[PDB]
Design an enzyme around this catalytic site. Structure first.
Site, PDB file in Angstrom:
ATOM      1  N   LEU A   1     -38.812  72.253  41.380  1.00 52.50           N
ATOM      2  CA  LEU A   1     -40.125  71.716  40.964  1.00 52.50           C
ATOM      3  C   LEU A   1     -40.515  72.298  39.747  1.00 52.50           C
ATOM      4  O   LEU A   1     -40.232  73.658  39.413  1.00 52.50           O
ATOM      5  CB  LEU A   1     -41.072  72.189  42.249  1.00 52.50           C
ATOM      6  CG  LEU A   1     -41.016  71.280  43.514  1.00 52.50           C
ATOM      7  CD1 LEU A   1     -42.033  71.502  44.469  1.00 52.50           C
ATOM      8  CD2 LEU A   1     -40.834  69.834  43.416  1.00 52.50           C
TER       9      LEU A   1
ATOM     10  N   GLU B   1     -48.890  72.686  49.758  1.00 52.41           N
ATOM     11  CA  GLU B   1     -48.732  71.140  49.238  1.00 52.41           C
ATOM     12  C   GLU B   1     -47.258  70.722  49.708  1.00 52.41           C
ATOM     13  O   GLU B   1     -46.987  69.718  50.276  1.00 52.41           O
ATOM     14  CB  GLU B   1     -48.372  71.437  47.761  1.00 52.41           C
ATOM     15  CG  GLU B   1     -48.754  70.312  46.883  1.00 52.41           C
ATOM     16  CD  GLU B   1     -47.716  69.130  47.191  1.00 52.41           C
ATOM     17  OE1 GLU B   1     -47.946  67.947  47.332  1.00 52.41           O
ATOM     18  OE2 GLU B   1     -46.282  69.266  47.157  1.00 52.41           O
TER      19      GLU B   1
HETATM   20  N1  NDP Z   1     -42.542  65.189  43.920  1.00 51.19           N
HETATM   21  C1  NDP Z   1     -41.767  65.814  43.294  1.00 51.19           C
HETATM   22  O1  NDP Z   1     -42.140  66.833  42.373  1.00 51.19           O
HETATM   23  C2  NDP Z   1     -40.274  65.404  43.403  1.00 51.19           C
HETATM   24  C3  NDP Z   1     -39.487  66.253  42.369  1.00 51.19           C
HETATM   25  N2  NDP Z   1     -38.186  65.748  42.555  1.00 51.19           N
HETATM   26  C4  NDP Z   1     -37.257  66.364  41.481  1.00 51.19           C
HETATM   27  O2  NDP Z   1     -36.715  65.764  40.579  1.00 51.19           O
HETATM   28  C5  NDP Z   1     -35.130  65.692  40.767  1.00 51.19           C
HETATM   29  C6  NDP Z   1     -34.440  64.475  41.388  1.00 51.19           C
HETATM   30  O3  NDP Z   1     -34.922  63.452  40.570  1.00 51.19           O
HETATM   31  P1  NDP Z   1     -33.910  62.415  39.577  1.00 51.19           P
HETATM   32  O4  NDP Z   1     -33.473  63.333  38.615  1.00 51.19           O
HETATM   33  O5  NDP Z   1     -34.865  61.390  38.640  1.00 51.19           O
HETATM   34  O6  NDP Z   1     -32.634  61.474  40.575  1.00 51.19           O
HETATM   35  P2  NDP Z   1     -32.388  60.894  41.900  1.00 51.19           P
HETATM   36  O7  NDP Z   1     -33.069  61.619  43.003  1.00 51.19           O
HETATM   37  O8  NDP Z   1     -32.972  59.587  41.897  1.00 51.19           O
HETATM   38  O9  NDP Z   1     -30.951  61.017  41.857  1.00 51.19           O
HETATM   39  C7  NDP Z   1     -30.358  60.262  41.041  1.00 51.19           C
HETATM   40  C8  NDP Z   1     -28.895  59.633  41.460  1.00 51.19           C
HETATM   41  O10 NDP Z   1     -29.154  58.791  42.958  1.00 51.19           O
HETATM   42  C9  NDP Z   1     -28.467  57.578  42.655  1.00 51.19           C
HETATM   43  N3  NDP Z   1     -29.774  56.641  42.605  1.00 51.19           N
HETATM   44  C10 NDP Z   1     -30.940  56.859  42.016  1.00 51.19           C
HETATM   45  N4  NDP Z   1     -31.549  55.498  42.301  1.00 51.19           N
HETATM   46  C11 NDP Z   1     -30.769  54.653  42.709  1.00 51.19           C
HETATM   47  C12 NDP Z   1     -30.761  53.380  43.336  1.00 51.19           C
HETATM   48  N5  NDP Z   1     -31.670  52.351  43.358  1.00 51.19           N
HETATM   49  N6  NDP Z   1     -29.580  52.792  43.881  1.00 51.19           N
HETATM   50  C13 NDP Z   1     -28.553  53.548  44.116  1.00 51.19           C
HETATM   51  N7  NDP Z   1     -28.496  54.841  43.571  1.00 51.19           N
HETATM   52  C14 NDP Z   1     -29.338  55.334  42.939  1.00 51.19           C
HETATM   53  C15 NDP Z   1     -27.429  57.683  41.240  1.00 51.19           C
HETATM   54  O11 NDP Z   1     -26.622  58.538  41.884  1.00 51.19           O
HETATM   55  P3  NDP Z   1     -25.085  57.937  41.586  1.00 51.19           P
HETATM   56  O12 NDP Z   1     -24.778  58.421  40.271  1.00 51.19           O
HETATM   57  O13 NDP Z   1     -24.371  59.006  42.631  1.00 51.19           O
HETATM   58  O14 NDP Z   1     -24.991  56.567  41.942  1.00 51.19           O
HETATM   59  C16 NDP Z   1     -28.406  58.450  40.222  1.00 51.19           C
HETATM   60  O15 NDP Z   1     -27.731  59.286  39.348  1.00 51.19           O
HETATM   61  C17 NDP Z   1     -34.941  67.241  41.468  1.00 51.19           C
HETATM   62  O16 NDP Z   1     -35.206  67.979  40.173  1.00 51.19           O
HETATM   63  C18 NDP Z   1     -36.125  67.157  42.373  1.00 51.19           C
HETATM   64  O17 NDP Z   1     -36.667  68.605  42.412  1.00 51.19           O
HETATM   65  C19 NDP Z   1     -37.595  64.579  43.384  1.00 51.19           C
HETATM   66  C20 NDP Z   1     -38.423  63.993  44.118  1.00 51.19           C
HETATM   67  C21 NDP Z   1     -39.862  64.490  44.218  1.00 51.19           C
HETATM   68  C1  D2H Z   2     -37.696  65.203  48.952  1.00 52.82           C
HETATM   69  C2  D2H Z   2     -37.423  66.606  48.500  1.00 52.82           C
HETATM   70  C3  D2H Z   2     -38.737  67.551  48.632  1.00 52.82           C
HETATM   71  C4  D2H Z   2     -38.326  68.530  49.844  1.00 52.82           C
HETATM   72  C5  D2H Z   2     -39.259  68.032  47.298  1.00 52.82           C
HETATM   73  C6  D2H Z   2     -40.414  67.504  46.435  1.00 52.82           C
HETATM   74  C7  D2H Z   2     -41.052  66.352  46.837  1.00 52.82           C
HETATM   75  C8  D2H Z   2     -40.671  64.973  46.841  1.00 52.82           C
HETATM   76  O1  D2H Z   2     -41.807  64.171  46.798  1.00 52.82           O
HETATM   77  C9  D2H Z   2     -42.993  65.212  47.103  1.00 52.82           C
HETATM   78  N1  D2H Z   2     -44.352  64.951  47.270  1.00 52.82           N
HETATM   79  C10 D2H Z   2     -45.120  66.018  47.529  1.00 52.82           C
HETATM   80  N2  D2H Z   2     -46.434  65.736  47.577  1.00 52.82           N
HETATM   81  N3  D2H Z   2     -44.660  67.379  47.150  1.00 52.82           N
HETATM   82  C11 D2H Z   2     -43.327  67.603  47.023  1.00 52.82           C
HETATM   83  N4  D2H Z   2     -42.945  68.941  46.896  1.00 52.82           N
HETATM   84  C12 D2H Z   2     -42.476  66.305  46.859  1.00 52.82           C
HETATM   85  C13 D2H Z   2     -38.807  69.245  46.643  1.00 52.82           C
HETATM   86  C14 D2H Z   2     -37.534  68.953  45.639  1.00 52.82           C
HETATM   87  C15 D2H Z   2     -36.870  69.808  45.016  1.00 52.82           C
HETATM   88  C16 D2H Z   2     -37.135  71.133  45.108  1.00 52.82           C
HETATM   89  C17 D2H Z   2     -38.428  71.504  45.955  1.00 52.82           C
HETATM   90  C18 D2H Z   2     -39.100  70.600  46.488  1.00 52.82           C
HETATM   91  O2  D2H Z   2     -40.291  70.909  47.440  1.00 52.82           O
HETATM   92  C19 D2H Z   2     -40.675  72.224  47.445  1.00 52.82           C
END
Ligand code: NDP
Ligand code: D2H
Length: 186
Positions: A22, A30
């Site tokens: 994050l 959160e």
């Molecule tokens: N709310 C928050 O603050 C959240 C934060 N995060 C953060 O961001 C990061 C993850 O995000 P991000 O880097 O965008 O990557 P993703 O989580 O989307 O992972 C990307 C991989 O999954 C596959 N993929 C993604 N979309 C598709 C699809 N439609 N169909 C098939 N495969 C797919 C591909 O893998 P492949 O190459 O194997 O096909 C791609 O390289 C982490 O740093 C996490 O902490 C993530 C969610 C929420």
């Molecule tokens: C699916 C992963 C989830 C566990 C996460 C992030 C959030 C995805 O949608 C989210 N939505 C909200 N309102 N908060 C979040 N925090 C996430 C996360 C990913 C990497 C590192 C720390 C994280 O949480 C501490």
């Protein structure tokens, strides 16, 4: 099968991640909110499903792997089987949602929650139909390398309140944030 929903926490400069973590320091409540929103199913004898990209799966602190009480599905074109501890694997979002209609999941799934990352969010959000976005606004800039897509407010209406979601400003570790719910139907 029920609603389609995205959930995200995002800083002012649109950031969601920095190197698989994050942008901001841990915000305990959160995170409890994320846990509660994604786990809570009304329909008895069903579970919510969570859909995430591969990166997002591997960013989950192992303590929460899988996310308990929910069905965990990873999206990857590279992987050949669900990662250790994940339940399902699809090659695209459209497949994931279709899988949901099949007999093996047809009436196990209540809500489906897309929980990341950037390209999954963008695709769900651009996908016509009824959809909600649960967006925590972290109200500072944090250095980030992955970003939430643009929310098109012509389509996504901010709801003035939502059951089970606090409407007022939260603060943890000297960082203010607030919870919002957007809804579209197109
Ligand atoms: N709310 C928050 O603050 C959240 C934060 N995060 C953060 O961001 C990061 C993850 O995000 P991000 O880097 O965008 O990557 P993703 O989580 O989307 O992972 C990307 C991989 O999954 C596959 N993929 C993604 N979309 C598709 C699809 N439609 N169909 C098939 N495969 C797919 C591909 O893998 P492949 O190459 O194997 O096909 C791609 O390289 C982490 O740093 C996490 O902490 C993530 C969610 C929420
Ligand atoms: C699916 C992963 C989830 C566990 C996460 C992030 C959030 C995805 O949608 C989210 N939505 C909200 N309102 N908060 C979040 N925090 C996430 C996360 C990913 C990497 C590192 C720390 C994280 O949480 C501490």
């Amino acid at each position: 099968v029920g609603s389609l929903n995205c959930i995200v926490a995002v800083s002012q400069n649109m950031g969601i991640g920095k190197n698989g973590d994050l942008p901001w320091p841990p915000l305990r409540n959160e995170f409890r909110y994320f846990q509660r929103m994604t786990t809570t199913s009304s329909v008895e004898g069903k579970q919510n499903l969570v859909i995430m990209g591969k990166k997002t799966w591997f960013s989950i602190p192992e303590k929460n792997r899988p996310l308990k009480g929910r069905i965990n599905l990873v999206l990857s074109r590279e992987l050949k089987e669900p990662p250790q501890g994940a339940h399902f694997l699809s090659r695209s979002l459209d497949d994931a949602l279709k899988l949901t209609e099949q007999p093996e999941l047809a009436n196990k799934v209540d809500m489906v929650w897309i929980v990341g990352g950037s390209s999954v969010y963008k695709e769900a959000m651009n996908h016509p139909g009824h959809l909600k976005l649960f967006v925590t606004r972290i109200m500072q800039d944090f250095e980030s390398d992955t970003f939430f897509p643009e929310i098109d407010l012509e389509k996504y209406k901010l709801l003035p309140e939502y059951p089970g979601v606090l409407s007022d400003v939260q603060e943890e570790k000297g960082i203010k944030y607030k919870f919002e719910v957007y809804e579209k139907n197109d």
